[PDB]
Design a protein around this ligand. Structure first.
Ligand SMILES: C[C@]12CC[C@@H]3c4ccc(O)cc4CC[C@H]3[C@@H]1C[C@@H](Br)[C@@H]2O
Ligand SMILES: C[C@]12CC[C@@H]3c4ccc(O)cc4CC[C@H]3[C@@H]1C[C@@H](Br)[C@@H]2O
Lengths: 117, 115, 117, 115
């Protein structure tokens, strides 16, 4: 909801990827990754409510999507540990970010849709 | 040499082997005329479809028969085939590689155009 | 709306692809492509209302997305004429189909999300 | 031979040339230890990163420095880099090709694992 949303789809089943764990980190002043927010995708493959416009300040963020556990639960041993998405946010003022990922066992893609509010 | 097709399997992390590929050229009456065809190799590649002489400017379609590939693997697919439609242009680079990455409910295709 | 929706995104701009022409065809009994529906994507990159559950019977359908005109209007000469999506629909009863496409000048992807109503 | 990286540019339909690539291996203290690196060739490829001897089972990360690539082209990009994280497994095929297809606001990566 509002400034950061994550959407995950399954390219094998043509479906939302449900119950996928997502961890967001923010680079701290000492160049370490600090925990920022986390959650799981819903029945629609979406994860809303990770942060607020106030909390989501300028910075470098990493969205980890735990794809390996997703595939393993479906009986599949996939190639990747997780899909990582690393980006600078809000450098030119607040924006609305949708981070999308499309998953296959040995491949994925990831796409950002960015809107000006 | 001027046209190659390369196909990968995103589920198995492998070349997509034995996939039928049909190339067509658009005729003056806007129908698709068979132009060349073959099956992908053990490396997922299909070479020797055409020649510099035959591959003149025009509109081409490459059909990759993905449904039969997934059916052989016992995996239910969405698409009948992947279609790639483009105009060949002499002003650009001399070689077209039409690549495709296949999943049961999604495909990605790219053109790598080089000299 | 209801059983067939098309969504188009621009991978260069990280935005919906707006005002993209979309033509849907259905294979007739004489194995020819008959016009079925058409429209343009909205400001959200979506195209709703192409058909109804009544009209969208079993068959083989082709969704043509006119990507070349889209890129040309942005000053770009792209590789493909259009993105084609060809599929059998409703073979096992009515379903809800979202046909998504992600566009770049020399590449695209397309993905179906299929739901049981 | 056991690890290759191949990078393509979806905007220009070309190999992505001169892209920095850094490989890391996960250490016992869960930090990332520099393992190998290089720049993609004129064919968008990076060979000779490691050896059969050195490429033991473990968790590896391949970072592809996409932001600097797009910046050089004058195109505003979204990601800092593309990351690819995986466990090397001796039970599987002997060669890993890590491929990536780049756009300014989207990337796709595949592992092609072969003998
Ligand atoms: C990058 C790629 C996967 C890797 C492919 C590949 C893999 C190994 C290799 O030796 C060559 C290629 C060329 C096509 C490449 C695909 C084009 C696009 Br459709 C796909 O994302
Ligand atoms: C995952 C996706 C980008 C995000 C798209 C998206 C974005 C926002 C949203 O609300 C829905 C979708 C569904 C299609 C999704 C695409 C399908 C495939 Br063609 C592409 O990789």
């Amino acid at each position: 909801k509002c400034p950061l949303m994550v959407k995950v789809l399954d390219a094998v089943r043509g479906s939302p990827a449900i119950n996928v764990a997502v961890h967001v980190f923010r680079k701290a002043a000492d160049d370490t990754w600090e925990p920022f927010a986390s959650g799981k995708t819903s029945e629609s493959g979406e994860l809303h409510g990770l942060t607020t416009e106030e909390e989501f300040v300028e910075g470098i963020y990493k969205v980890e999507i735990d794809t390996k556990s997703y595939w393993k639960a479906l009986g599949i041993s996939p190639f990747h540990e997780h899909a990582e998405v690393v980006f600078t946010a809000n450098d030119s003022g607040p924006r609305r970010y949708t981070i999308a990922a499309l998953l296959s066992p040995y491949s994925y893609s990831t796409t950002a849709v960015v809107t000006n509010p």
